[PDB]
Ligand binder design. Structure first.
Ligand SMILES: [Zn+2]
Ligand SMILES: [Zn+2]
Length: 63
């Protein structure tokens, strides 16, 4: 639809579910990134940095 993502998961083009931040600094949905790294390869699709499941940390939005 509208073009212009604001903290969005490019994998599903949906708003971030549970928001898991990578060490790369990119936040993805807690499932989309997992199903992209243990299925295709361990990388963030945007910029191809090596991403591991244990390296993912849910973002604290309670601040
Ligand atoms: Zn997603
Ligand atoms: Zn990245």
């Amino acid at each position: 639809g509208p073009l212009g993502s604001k903290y969005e998961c490019p994998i599903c083009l949906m708003a971030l579910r549970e928001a898991v931040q990578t060490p790369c600094g990119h936040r993805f949905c807690k499932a989309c990134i997992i199903k992209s790294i243990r299925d295709a390869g361990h990388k963030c699709p945007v910029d191809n940095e090596i991403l591991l499941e244990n390296q993912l940390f849910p973002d604290n939005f309670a601040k």
